[PDB]
Design a protein around this ligand. Structure first.
Ligand SMILES: NC(=O)c1ccc[n+]([C@@H]2O[C@H](COP(=O)([O-])OP(=O)(O)OC[C@H]3O[C@@H](n4cnc5c(N)ncnc54)[C@H](O)[C@@H]3O)[C@@H](O)[C@H]2O)c1
Ligand SMILES: NC(=O)c1ccc[n+]([C@@H]2O[C@H](COP(=O)([O-])OP(=O)(O)OC[C@H]3O[C@@H](n4cnc5c(N)ncnc54)[C@H](O)[C@@H]3O)[C@@H](O)[C@H]2O)c1
Ligand SMILES: [Zn+2]
Ligand SMILES: [Zn+2]
Ligand SMILES: [Zn+2]
Ligand SMILES: [Zn+2]
Lengths: 377, 377
């Protein structure tokens, strides 16, 4: 390699402080250390988690940072000990890591690895506690263990899923978070049953992923709910048999859904991050056995509430992180399902744009006119 | 039978108004209308559910009425159409019905029959909207579908479980409420796996049934929590391995449990009815997969709260009504298990008194002098 062992200069989008546009300038990326992988991103998408940390909402937010966490790339070099991947391999960097040995990687019903989360959340690396980006000798900090807003990034060995070398990296960059989450929420968390009734709250990428997996699961009725009727026709494509605007009704949205279905829906998914809607989705879960899965991320410190009656009479409140998928073992599986023509992964992307335009991708987001925009360099 | 079709003059305990003593006088019990069943009560027990309504704290309350809902007895006569039982059958009248045909009886995960609840909730019979007790002509209303504080009572067919002729009626009366709830919380709602860790909050009858079942499910560790440490000996007898008093500790009780285990207990049970503890029980359920079952009924107007993060990071909130036991189907199955010699059911009875002393039995309940007090005629 020209590059291996050497630092690397490349074009990144740096966030200097919150609530403020991104600076597409140049960055130096250190060589990878023990148990690390330097990845060359080739495509990367925008997620609402990214705009949320840009808004000063994250308590653990650490500026300056390189945002970005939905991406695919190519291994460029690895540090010492790294036997899982080798330069040339095609990868998806995963904010949710996989160790194989900790308590949660072993339990069949979780994926909340504790391998490296102590450090990715502070923005640094495990080998020496310091980050790996630099701008004029001053450190830039990592976000969510990935930082896919640079041409090259360095990530923990536990965070790289190796994928089929023949998958289009400008499509499966979506499998690195948002779309996987909505899929797993149905398949792993809720385990949606054939013939069930589903109600999804919020028809963004995640929301539509839920609706997709719900059809693939045999849902006999999928109710979609958004305060944006211009999301309905795409939602009916992905499989929604019903579309509801809460503003079109007086009764609270929960009582509305309980009315169309008599008792509620077998499964309800909240893909917004609003605690009022969360409580609402629980309360239109079906009496006696309904499940509500909280998918979205709320403002830190904000609370959800309901009446204990809603659970003493049969509903179940749960959540999901990255759809419950065990990243490294199972993200290669999602690529495989993609490569068998089984998903609608292609329909999720609405805009391909170049990385110099990152800041206008954020304004196309903040207005909800796209679902997902893949950026290439 | 000398009493089929006639009214019966029997001894009973009438709640004339809230917050006064009951009156042990004679009452007139109509014969069973269609689909109804008249039952000679041979033993009956007290619950604090009876006290809370007698105390004037029920919004659903209706006076005068005849409380009592944990009993066992013998069919005296049956109304028109009734084939499931016959005179001489031994029965447990359950406050939770089983009709076999509503959409909750045909579902594996519920026991919340809707066939008669609209009429029992108002102390009447479904067949004509009216009660079946009278004094001097004026009507006395039912309680919970059962009204077991009377030598004879009239109940809905859907409410009558047919049990072994060899069970001692002065022990299985417990199976119509509190013990079943606690057991069913473990076996049906949580399904505690062998080897796992449990915390129980509240060491009354329900909480002890939770411990008992948790030991029998094979739980490696059972943590009992209560602010009255004088319940720790008996809790230990039922299979506990630790005892916590939240007042001994200078941090939130959910921190104590989460520190005694590394990440919380795999299952937690709230057996009090106190929404703050409800949240504590949820927040000390194991990260990633923990399950919290609300078993206690909160004061009306209270609300459970947590941060949505708690659910996203893998905890599941749920609850249970009568242990999710499909009453008429499975209460016979619990009576059979009892007689196999597999349960500690006899150990929940702390006193045996005469029906004339129902009021001293109610003063014992108010002080904790009493797990379950059983009355006979
Ligand atoms: N749990 C996880 O592992 C995980 C992973 C990825 C994303 N997320 C969270 O999922 C949420 C959604 O992800 P996205 O990328 O789909 O967001 P997105 O913003 O594309 O979708 C937002 C949708 O919410 C709708 N909405 C807003 N308020 C509403 C209301 N009151 N009633 C009905 N609809 C309403 C908007 O109209 C819009 O369509 C985000 O909060 C993100 O943080 C969670
Ligand atoms: N879900 C159902 O179908 C069903 C059926 C029957 C009863 N229940 C509910 O179960 C609950 C209890 O049943 P019981 O027979 O155990 O009642 P009980 O009153 O004997 O038990 C009360 C216990 O709670 C403990 N307690 C009170 N505040 C506490 C705190 N802050 N922290 C820790 N411990 C505390 C007391 O010390 C006492 O031991 C009731 O609220 C009742 O509504 C539910
Ligand atoms: Zn995301
Ligand atoms: Zn791990
Ligand atoms: Zn009771
Ligand atoms: Zn029914």
């Amino acid at each position: 390699s020209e590059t291996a062992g050497k630092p690397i200069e490349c074009k990144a989008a740096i966030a200097w402080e919150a609530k403020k546009p991104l600076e597409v300038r140049t960055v130096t990326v250190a060589p990878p250390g023990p148990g690390e992988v330097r990845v060359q991103i080739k495509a990367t998408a925008l997620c609402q988690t990214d705009a949320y940390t840009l808004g000063g909402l994250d308590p653990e937010g650490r500026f300056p940072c390189i945002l970005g966490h939905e991406a695919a790339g190519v291994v460029e070099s690895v540090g010492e000990g790294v036997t899982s991947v080798k330069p040339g391999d095609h990868v998806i960097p995963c904010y949710q890591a996989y160790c194989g040995e900790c308590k949660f990687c072993k339990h069949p019903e979780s994926n909340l690895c504790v391998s490296v989360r102590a450090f990715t959340g502070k923005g640094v690396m495990k080998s020496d506690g310091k980050p790996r980006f630099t701008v004029d000798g001053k450190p830039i900090y990592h976000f969510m263990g990935t930082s896919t807003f640079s041409e090259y990034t360095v990530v923990h060995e536990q965070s790289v899923a190796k994928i089929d070398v023949n998958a289009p990296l400008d499509k499966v960059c979506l499998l690195g978070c948002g779309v996987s989450t909505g899929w797993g929420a149905v398949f792993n968390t809720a385990k949606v049953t054939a013939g069930s009734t589903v109600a999804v709250f919020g028809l963004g990428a995640v929301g539509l992923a839920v609706i997709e997996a719900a059809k693939r699961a045999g849902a006999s009725r999928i109710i979609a709910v958004d305060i944006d009727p211009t999301k309905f026709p795409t939602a009916k494509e992905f499989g929604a048999t019903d579309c509801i605007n809460p503003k079109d009704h007086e009764k609270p949205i929960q009582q509305v859904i309980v009315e169309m279905t008599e008792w509620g829906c077998d499964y309800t998914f909240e893909c917004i991050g609003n605690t009022a809607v969360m409580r609402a989705a629980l309360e239109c879960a079906h009496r006696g056995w309904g499940t509500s899965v909280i998918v979205g991320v709320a403002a830190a410190g904000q609370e959800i509430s309901t009446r204990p009656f809603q659970l003493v009479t049969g509903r179940r409140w749960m959540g999901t992180a990255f759809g419950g998928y065990k990243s490294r073992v199972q993200v290669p599986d999602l690529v495989t399902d993609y490569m068998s023509g089984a998903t609608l992964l292609d329909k999720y992307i609405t805009h391909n744009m170049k990385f110099d335009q990152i800041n206008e991708a954020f304004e196309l987001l903040h207005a909800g006119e796209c679902l997902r925009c893949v950026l290439t360099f």
